[PDB]
């Protein structure tokens, strides 16, 4: 019921709603409305690139989409209004690789 | 653009402002104002924790400030309105470790 890492959720942007992948780890969630969840926005309008790996309707989007890992953002948990689905392990690995590149990590 | 990874910049949050550490890599910068830079906000009102490492006034901020790595977010380059300073390399390593933990990277 609570957002889980790897979940695709609909996010209220304050008002449009757009999907995003939860990328912060499950151990951080205390279950209050005002805690920050780190999400990667998902777009059905941007082209795929190595930093925008594709996301399929099986994973919860309505049309072929990409995860905009350069748009990674912490947002209030209260903005996560509906769970849409869950990503394949390979999609999550591509997202982890993009985020590793973007942030210059080991 | 001019903000470099490891820099402290003042970020206009729309009006509130906060210092933040640039954490995205320099090769992503194409020199357009609306391109996204990933930053970690700095707080002087929260206690230090392993996920909120301290930032020294030597690095450009107020006393007892911490990098709130759970608040990592991409912002438009235009929101970075003043260069404040640069982090010591060990602070950057503490932040990189916190972000690796928060995002479940290898």
């Amino acid at each position: 019921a609570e957002p889980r890492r790897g979940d695709l959720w609909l996010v209220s942007l304050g008002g449009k709603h757009r999907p995003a992948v939860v990328v912060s780890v499950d151990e951080l969630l205390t279950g209050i409305d005002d805690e920050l969840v780190v999400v990667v926005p998902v777009s059905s309008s941007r082209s795929r690139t190595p930093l925008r790996p594709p996301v399929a309707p099986s994973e919860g989007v309505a049309a072929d989409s990409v995860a905009v890992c350069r748009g990674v953002r912490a947002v209030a948990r209260a903005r996560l209004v509906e769970r849409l689905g869950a990503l394949k392990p390979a999609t999550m690995r591509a997202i982890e690789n993009a985020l590793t590149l973007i942030l210059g990590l080991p | 653009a001019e903000p470099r990874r490891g820099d402290l910049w003042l970020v206009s949050l729309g009006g509130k402002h906060r210092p933040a550490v640039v954490v995205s890599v320099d090769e992503l910068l194409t020199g357009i104002d609306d391109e996204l830079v990933v930053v970690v906000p700095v707080s002087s009102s929260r206690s230090r924790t392993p996920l909120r490492p301290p930032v020294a006034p030597s690095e450009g901020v107020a006393a007892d400030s911490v990098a709130v790595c759970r608040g990592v977010r991409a912002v438009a380059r235009a929101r970075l309105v003043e260069r404040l300073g640069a982090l010591k390399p060990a602070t950057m390593r503490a932040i990189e470790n916190a972000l690796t933990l928060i995002l479940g990277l290898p």
Binding site: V11, L13, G14, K16, R18, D34, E35, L36, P41, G71, R73, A74, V75, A76, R79 | L13, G14, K16, R18, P41, S43, V68, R70, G71, R73, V75, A76, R79
Partner: peptide, 10 residues
């Protein structure tokens, strides 16, 4: 688009 989230938790 996502701009309104820029101030969350701060």
């Amino acid at each position: 688009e996502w701009e309104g989230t820029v101030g969350d938790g701060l």
